[PDB]
Amino acid sequence: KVFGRCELAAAMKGLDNYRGYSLGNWVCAAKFESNFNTQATNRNTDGSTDYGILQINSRWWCNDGRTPGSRNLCNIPCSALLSSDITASVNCAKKIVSDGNGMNAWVAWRNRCKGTDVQAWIRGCRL
């Protein structure tokens, strides 16, 4: 499913201020990570693949059966992260952001959202 900005913001309200990260940060990351598309996937140089709305990596978080040495810390097959229901992505994202590096774990957030007016991303949305 390709989400609308405000639609995704409402879907992501459980992440609003989680670990101190305002909702705008989460919507901005999704935009630049998957362009609001739950079915997005990207293979990396190291053989791992990023999945879904938040492009969660198969090396540590989910199992895709083709990433040798993978850890599957979120205990889910990566395909669960491609569903139109983003719950699994939201619950795995919570573990990742708690890992110690915060949202810096998402390269697109670090390079395109961090230190910007992220409030603009939920502007106009009825929450």
Tell me if residue 37 falls in helix, strand or coil. Answer: strand
| Helix locations, 4-121, DSSP H | 5-11, 23-34, 87-98, 107-112
Number of neighbours of residue 105 by Cβ within 10 angstroms: 19
Tell me if residue 43 falls in helix, strand or coil. Answer: strand
| Cα dist from 32 to 36, 68, 80, 113, whole Å | 8, 27, 20, 9
Q: Which residues pair with 2 in a beta bridge?
A: 37
Residues 28, 113 contacting (CB under 8 angstroms): yes
The 10 Å CB-count burial string (b at 16+, else e) for 51-64 is: bbbbbbbbbbbbbb
Structure tokens at 38: 């739950």
Show the 3-state SS of 6-27: HHHHHHCHHHCCECCECHHHHH
| Cα dist from 66 to 22, 54, 106, whole Å | 34, 20, 22
Known binding-site residues for substrate equal 99
| Structure determined by | X-ray
Residues 56, 97 contacting (CB under 8 angstroms): no
In terms of residue numbers, what domain contains 103? Answer: 1-127
Known binding-site residues equal 99
The span from the CA of 72 to the CA of 58, in Å, is 7
Residues 93, 56 contacting (CB under 8 angstroms): yes
Query: How many domains are contained in the chain?
Result: 1
Surface-to-core class of residue 126, CB atoms within 10 Å of its CB (0-12 exposed, 13-18 middle, 19+ buried): exposed
Tell me if residue 46 falls in helix, strand or coil. Answer: coil
The CATH number that applies at residue 8 is: 1.10.530.10
By annotation, the residues acting in catalysis are 33, 50
